[PDB]
Structure formats: structure tokens, C-alpha cells
């Protein structure tokens, strides 16, 4: 039996969601990008409800809850794709019905972004990332998202501390063979931050070109 915060995050983990690319629409970059932005829009709803299960998140000001999500949302989306992809080779599981290989990434104009997501996948495969570690890192990525606009700095630090403590407690109990495993997990966050910045810049530019329709919530997070 391990850390209660980790157990709680596991039960809070949202259900799988399908991409459901429109089978009447011809394959194209615009279809692939529409499908991914539509999938992100739906996952963002699910991410908002998930964050409310994080101990202490709901006690922040709605302003601070918004700030954390506005900074971390794309990291949370990327970590989901990364976790789903760990048993695959050079493929990204956006959804069980939407697995992109290199050819498809090329066809969508996503080769560079997807190669960086695959770099995250490669590191977590080598580390044998567990679901417990995944859900704890997602919560840490949210709490540690470095928003410029935080009101209650000390409360956000306490949230970081609670989740960091849960990771350290989990690793101390489950991974006695590697007393630095928690730190190794924290050392994966810079690549997640870098890949997230690349993703947001890329989809912001697609927003500017105006050829890919996007729903309200995805647009709001891109514009933040």
C-alpha cells in the first residue's frame, strides 16, 4: 500500500476519449489538424474537472485556478499522449482511434513537434514510467506551471510541495533500488515544458492562418 495522494490521482484519472475523425472527409493536413484541435477541445473539459480532484486546487482563487490551467494545459495534453504511447514504437497514441506514425506526422506538418513528443516517450520508456508516476507528474506539471499572474504565491508553493512530497513518498516505498528516482522524474519536466511551448506556438500559428476551425475552449487556452 502506497501514498494516498497517488491513489487519489489514479481514481481521478479521466476515461479515454475517441478522436472520431470524420470518415466522410478526405485525408489532409486540415482534417488531421481539425481532428487534433477537436480532440484537445474535449480533453480540456475533462482536464478542468480532473484538476478539481487535486488536493487543495479548489481552495485557490478562481483566478489562480485559471492561471495554473492557462500555463499547464498543453503539458497535461502532451503527457497523456506520451503515457498512451509507451508500449508503441515511433507512433503517438492521440486516441485509440488516432495513432500517428512519421508518415502521418509529415502529412499533418507535425514531424518536428511529434519527434519532440517521441523524445519524451523514449526517455519515459527507458525509465519504465508507471501510471502512478504519470498521474503524479501531470499534477506536478499543473502546480509548477510558472504562470506570471499568480495571486497567492505561497498557496501555489504549498500545492507544489504536497505533490512533490507524494512523488518522493511513492518513490521511497516503491523504488528503494534507486533513491534518486523522484529527482530523475522531476528532471523530465524541462523537456515537457519545451515540447509544450513548441506545440502552443505551432497551433497559435495555425489559428493565425485561419484554415483550421477551432472550438471556444481550445481557442481561449491558445489565446491566454
Amino acid at each position: 500500500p502506497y501514498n494516498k495522494i497517488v491513489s487519489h490521482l489514479l481514481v481521478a484519472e479521466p476515461e479515454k476519449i475517441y478522436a472520431m475523425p470524420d470518415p466522410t472527409v478526405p485525408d489532409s493536413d486540415i482534417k488531421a489538424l481539425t481532428t487534433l484541435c477537436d480532440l484537445a477541445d474535449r480533453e480540456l473539459v475533462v482536464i478542468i474537472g480532473w484538476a478539481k480532484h487535486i488536493p487543495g486546487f479548489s481552495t485557490l482563487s478562481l483566478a489562480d485556478q485559471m492561471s495554473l490551467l492557462q500555463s499547464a494545459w498543453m503539458e497535461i495534453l502532451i503527457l497523456g499522449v506520451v503515457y498512451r504511447s509507451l508500449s508503441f514504437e515511433d507512433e503517438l497514441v492521440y486516441a485509440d482511434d488516432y495513432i500517428m506514425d512519421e508518415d502521418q506526422s509529415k502529412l499533418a506538418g507535425l514531424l518536428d513537434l511529434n519527434n519532440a513528443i517521441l523524445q519524451l516517450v523514449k526517455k519515459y520508456k527507458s525509465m519504465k514510467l508507471e501510471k502512478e508516476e504519470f498521474v503524479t507528474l501531470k499534477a506536478i506539471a499543473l502546480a509548477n506551471s510558472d504562470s506570471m499572474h499568480i495571486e497567492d504565491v505561497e498557496a501555489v508553493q504549498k500545492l507544489q510541495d504536497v505533490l512533490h512530497e507524494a512523488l518522493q513518498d511513492y518513490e521511497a516505498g516503491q523504488h528503494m533500488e534507486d533513491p534518486r528516482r523522484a529527482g530523475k522524474m522531476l528532471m523530465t519536466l524541462p523537456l515537457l515544458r519545451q515540447t509544450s511551448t513548441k506545440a502552443v506556438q505551432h497551433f497559435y500559428n495555425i489559428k493565425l492562418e485561419g484554415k483550421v476551425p477551432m472550438h471556444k475552449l481550445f481557442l481561449e487556452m491558445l489565446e491566454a
Partner: peptide
């Protein structure tokens, strides 16, 4: 205060 994100965060 027109934000969908704020609306979903308030949503019970």
C-alpha cells in the same frame, strides 16, 4: 468574466 474556462471551473 465571459470565459468558458471560468464557467467550467464554477460548474458544479
Amino acid at each position: 468574466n465571459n470565459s468558458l474556462l471560468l464557467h467550467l471551473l464554477k460548474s458544479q
